């Protein structure tokens, strides 16, 4: 059901997505242990993910949340990095994409910092790094992450010692 449409680097849509990626890189407290050492990315491709069924699933739930929260879906665009990105784009997010042992409970995690989601691309804590070189800081291998539309509704505020 999913088709992927390549965006041209000349397209305003490509440029605003790339800007969000690059401008939200930060330094991490592990000194690059999990996701590598870097201040910026080489963006190779940005594809729009198009799936009618998954979109209608999303907007149906969004309306329910909005209606429970003074007509405010509290919708954000947020990053998600995962070894399962290929399953996600075809089948949608589900419990098999849950971070069972994460800080705030068994749920699906997203970040405002692209570099935070990058720590999860090769698995929890960077796993064993790229498949080819076993390198969490690989500068050669192509990585993928998702920039996702996320309905937060009424969000519980958890201050964390992070």
């Amino acid at each position: 059901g999913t088709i992927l449409i390549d965006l041209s680097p000349d397209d305003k849509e490509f440029q605003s997505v790339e800007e969000e990626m690059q401008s939200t890189v930060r330094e991490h407290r592990d000194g690059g242990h999990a996701g590598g050492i870097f201040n910026r990315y080489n963006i190779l491709k940005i594809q729009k993910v198009c799936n009618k069924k998954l979109w209608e699933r999303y907007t149906h739930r969004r309306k329910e949340v909005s209606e429970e929260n003074h007509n405010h879906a509290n919708e954000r665009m947020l990053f998600h990095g995962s070894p399962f990105v290929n399953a996600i784009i075809h089948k949608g997010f589900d419990e098999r994409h849950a971070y069972i042992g994460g800080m705030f409970g068994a749920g699906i995690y997203f970040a405002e910092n692209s570099s935070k989601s990058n720590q999860y691309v090769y698995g929890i804590g960077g796993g064993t790094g790229c498949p080819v070189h076993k390198d969490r800081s690989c500068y050669i291998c192509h990585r993928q992450l998702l920039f996702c539309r996320v309905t937060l509704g009424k969000s519980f505020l958890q201050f964390s010692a992070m």
């Binding site: 992927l4 990626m21 930060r26 590598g36 050492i37 870097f38 990315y41 080489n42 963006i43 190779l44 491709k45 940005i46 594809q47 729009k48 993910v49 998954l54 979109w55 699933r57 999303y58 739930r61 969004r62 949340v65 429970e68 947020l78 990105v85 996600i88 997010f93 994460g102 800080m103 705030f104 409970g105 068994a106 749920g107 699906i108 995690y109 997203f110 970040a111 990058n118 690989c138 500068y139 192509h142 990585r143 993928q144 992450l145 998702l146 920039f147 996702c148 539309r149 996320v150 309905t151 937060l152 509704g153 009424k154 969000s155 519980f156 505020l157 958890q158 201050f159 010692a161 992070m162």
Partner: protein, 47 residues
């Protein structure tokens, strides 16, 4: 997969120590996100 705190739809993890870290968020239903853009990239070695 856990539940949302009663009467909430998600959790906002707001870093209290590192003033430069941005927020992280958790949803408890897959239908609350749509994977809109797939981004293929390399990280770059600092110069």
């Amino acid at each position: 997969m856990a539940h949302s705190p009663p009467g909430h739809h998600s959790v906002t993890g707001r870093p209290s120590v590192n003033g430069l870290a941005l927020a992280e968020y958790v949803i408890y239903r897959g239908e609350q996100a749509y994977p809109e853009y797939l981004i293929t990239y390399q990280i770059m070695r600092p110069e």
